Amino acid sequence: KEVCYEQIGCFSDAEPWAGTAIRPLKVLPWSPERIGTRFLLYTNKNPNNFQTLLPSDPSTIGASNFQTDKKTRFIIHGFIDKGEENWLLDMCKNMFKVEEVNCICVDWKKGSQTSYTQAANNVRVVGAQVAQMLSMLSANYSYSPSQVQLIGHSLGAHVAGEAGSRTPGLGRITGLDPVEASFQGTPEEVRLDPTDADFVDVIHTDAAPLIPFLGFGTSQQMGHLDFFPNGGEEMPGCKKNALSQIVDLDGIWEGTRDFVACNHLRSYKYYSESILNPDGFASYPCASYRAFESNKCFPCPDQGCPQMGHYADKFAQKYFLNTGDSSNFARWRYGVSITLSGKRATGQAKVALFGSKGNTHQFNIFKGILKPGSTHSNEFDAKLDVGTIEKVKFLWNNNNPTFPKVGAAKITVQKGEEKTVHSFCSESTVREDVLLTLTPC
Ligand SMILES: *[C@@H]1O[C@H](CO)[C@@H](O)[C@H](O)[C@H]1NC(C)=O
Ligand SMILES: [Ca+2]
């Protein structure tokens, strides 16, 4: 069977769309009018109220604040959680704080709020409509798709994939936690993949297996650059879903079943913040999140670390990094080596960096027997880049009738984005819970 819609062509239920083991059900995409796709344009001139654009009517572009001399960024959603309807606009608003741009929100909510197989297939049509908007801009306004980025969250990532597939030379597609079900294992035609655009960057935030962890995202690398903040499966500050061998995808997408969307939505929360923090998400290539957490993949490679999020395009396999558990998710990773002094004691040795741009909190470096003349290292993610490190503060908390004094004769510090190391020293020691300051050496 095949359905054909005006100007966007036809869609069949032939393989790989259906009739396969990965996509068993033969379901065709709803019509453009049932889906009700809307292209809402926001620009710095009109940051609060939209102007409606129609891909079949060039005049809407003339009757809008659209600028042919600016970049364009489409925001295409997927799963909408209660209270989350304004996220796309919230994201455009952050773009306006750093650039003059045409921000088009693509709302196709009616087409997404139905059974999963139907929502998955409706993606085909929405992506064809986005490609339609792009062919029209190209045709009637000589505006090249190289000047466009498609940001697709969840099912929207595959909507972007489709658009790219249909629009040769699209500059960029950012996938924010692309859904896995009905897309993994299919020909590149069905899913977002590197061939959909000149640069495809992907953020994974809910990649644990659907069964039984109810993870909506994918573990599979899908772009030129793939980022797995906090490992990509569980995000700090997010509650998780109760396990189950039986998941009701249809019920969750039609909005009748409970679902903890926190992990799935983090992808766009981090992207939105990255727009405002150009250095807050340095990412490190690593074999696994465990190797990263075991201090095996730091500092940044010679050429630098790519930023996860908005500025990932500045960069010329798997990338890891950590974020905060709440807003200003931005973090900067540092490495430190403490050579102990004073007397033997058992406890938790800590360090805080004080630089030109500010200082960090105290971070746990090593816990155990603190023996003079020994050296221990660790890496931690702080809340800011301290700039030039001017001094470091050592502190230890004990776990002794002689009131031992523990110190650090030397602390070396390594900023993730620098090639050199910085040395700080002291000949002093302090008692538990007393701050010792080390100076340059
Ligand atoms: C847009 O370009 C197409 C293809 O060249 C043309 O058929 C159509 O009439 C143009 N639209 C308008 C409003 O001129
Ligand atoms: Ca594709």
- Phi and psi torsions of 86, nearest 5°: -90, 10
Residue 81, marked binder: no
Other CB atoms within 10 Å distance of the CB of residue 426: 20
123: left (phi over 0), alpha (psi -120 to 50) or beta: alpha
Dist CA 214 CA 181 (whole Å) = 11
Examine the residue annotation and report whether 288 is marked as an active-site residue of this protein. Answer: no
Ion ligand 2 neighbours (CB, 5 A) are 161, 165, 188, 193, 196
Rg (the chain; Cα; Å): 25
Catalytic residue among 264, 272, 341, 422, which?
Answer: 264
Within this chain, domains 1-331 and 332-439 share the same CATH topology = no
Is 264 assigned a catalytic role?
yes
Closest CA to 178 of 197, 199, 211, 200: 200
Residue 420: exposed, middle, or buried by beta-carbon count in 10 A (0-12, 13-18, 19+)?
Answer: exposed
3-state secondary structure the chain: CEEEECCCEEEECCCCCCCCCCCCCCCCCCCHHHHCCEEEEECCCCCCCCEEEECCECHHHHCCCCCCCCEEEEEECCCCCCCCCCHHHHHHHHHCCCCCEEEEEEECHHHHCCCHHHHHHHHHHHHHHHHHHHHHHHHHHCCCHHHEEEEEECHHHHHHHHHHHCCCCCCEEEEECCECCCCCCCCCCCCCCHHHCCEEEEECCCCCCHHHHCCCECCCCCCCEEEEECCCCCCCCCCCCCCCCCCCHHHHHCCCCCCCCHHHHHHHHHHHHHHHCCCCCECEECCCHHHHHCCCCCCCCCCCCCECCHHHHHCCCEEEECCCCCCCCCCEEEEEEEEEEECCEEEEEEEEEEECCEECCCEEEEEEEECCCCEEEEEEEECCCCCCEEEEEEEEEECCCCCCCEEEEEEEEEECCCCCCEEEECCCCECCCCCEEEEEC
The closest alpha carbon to 253, from 106, 84, 105, 118, belongs to 118
Residue 273 CB burial class (10 angstroms; 0-12, 13-18, ≥19)? buried
Q: What contacts 85, CB < 8 A, 6 or more positions away?
A: none
Cα atoms in the Cβ-side hemisphere of radius 13 Å centred on 159? 34
- 347, amino acid identity: G
Q: How close is the Cα of 159 to the center of ligand 2, in Å?
A: 9
**CATH number for the domain formed by residue range(s) 332-439:** 2.60.60.20
Ligand 1 mean position to 50 CA, how many Å? 25
84 annotated among ligand-binding-site residues: no
| Sole residue written with tokens 């990338």 | 319
Where are the domains positioned within the chain? Answer: 1-331, 332-439
- Neighbouring residues of 173: CB distance < 8 A, sequence distance ≥ 6: 149, 150, 151, 152, 157, 160, 161, 163, 164, 192, 196, 197, 199, 200, 223
CA of 140 from ligand 1 middle (Å) equals 6
Declared resolution, Å: 2.1
Q: Are strands 422-425 and 148-153 parallel, antiparallel or unpaired?
A: unpaired
Active site residue 294: no
Does the annotation flag 193 for ligand binding?
yes
Provide residues with CB under 6 Å of ligand 1.
58, 139-140
Pocket test for ligand 1, best of 53, 56, 140, 141 (most atoms within 8 A of CB): 140
Answer whether 393's CB lies under 8 Å from 387's CB: no
Neighbours of 351 (CB within 10 A): 26
Q: How far is the CA of 42 from the centre of ligand 2 (A)?
A: 27
CA of 58, closest atom in ligand 1: 13
Task: Report how far residue 363's alpha carbon sits from residue 395's, in angstroms, rounded to the nearest whole number.
Answer: 9
Nearest CA to ligand 1 atom 1: 140
Placement of tokens 């998710």 in the chain: 329
**CA 377, CA 339: separation in Å to the nearest integer?**
9
Q: How was this structure determined?
A: X-ray
**Ramachandran quadrant class, 177 (left: phi over 0; alpha: psi -120 to 50; beta: rest):** left
Among 3.30.230.80, 3.40.50.2300, 3.30.70.890, 3.40.50.1820, what is the CATH number of 1-331?
Answer: 3.40.50.1820
- Going 340 to 343 to 344 to 347, the CA torsion angle's sign is negative
Catalytic residue among 112, 154, 165, 337: 154
60-77 per-residue burial string, b: 16 or more CB within 10 A, e: under 16: bbeebebeeebbbbbbbb
